Amino acid sequence: VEQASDLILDEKIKVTFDANVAAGLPWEFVPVQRDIDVRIGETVQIMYRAKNLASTPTTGQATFNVTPMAAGAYFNKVQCFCFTETTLEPGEEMEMPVVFFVDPEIVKPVETQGIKTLTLSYTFYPREPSK
Template sequence: MTVQNDNTKVSNRRNIGVATACVVFVGGMVGMAYAAVPLYQLFCQVTGYGGTTQRVEQMSEVVLDRTINVTFDANASSGLNWDFKAVDKKVTPRIGETVQIMYTATNNSSHPVTGEAIFNVTPGEAGAYFNKVQCFCFTETTLQPGETLEMPVVFFVDPAIVEAEETKGIGTITLSYTFYPRDDQEPVAALSVGEDKEQPKL
């Protein structure tokens, strides 16, 4: 009888241990899910991994006579009722030349919505040489119902792209943005027609 009780106690301890481990594991996964986006953002910005562009504070001092094609892609996730598009579909700047292009986003829903854009460059090898001076990526953007916002991107292609063996033959670079809804935003009731509201700051 004593042996059976001892076995039962051991079994209960094991069950409690397994349950505790499961809770800790699930909690850790949830925490990693929240941390994944900012950690991935930091990793990509530092390394240029996956075609992630580089953010710089100043323009290139060297401009080559050679040009390169740069095309622009725009996507909105299925959970975001926005019309997001690239106004400029393609430019052909000289390598090292600073260029400004424009994207626009329109909120088609009946309530304010906050979105955030991620981006990448293809081919991936070009990401480390695509330098953005100004962009809207990884920034929370809130649009009121029916509001349209112009979002500029200022960039240049680093002249060093023509020197690296894996990139010197690249003739076209594509910059692609995808907007996603912010999952952590609180629902905001739409304003009634005629109700006063503070104008959004652009």
């Protein structure tokens, strides 16, 4: 419920935020850490910063894959309305909080059965004018 307060058994989930950026998004999209720990629900705060380094505005409606492979399904809050990243003029600092906690239901099916690093491959690469 964008908390977990039952699901939080003291079992450690790792998560590994592979934040990639390419030309298409000429924004200084810094990961906070490459990774986090959550105890399977432990509802953390991890911000992100994207500072625009272009000479004209861009958009930033970037694709993400929230899975090492098997899981994805067991990611809590795979999408929502009001995408954080969006649009910036040539200079400005976007920064936004994120919250992330893996569902312990991951440790149920044969699918995953050991899988517990909900790796978020972010690919910041829509369209660049000329930075």
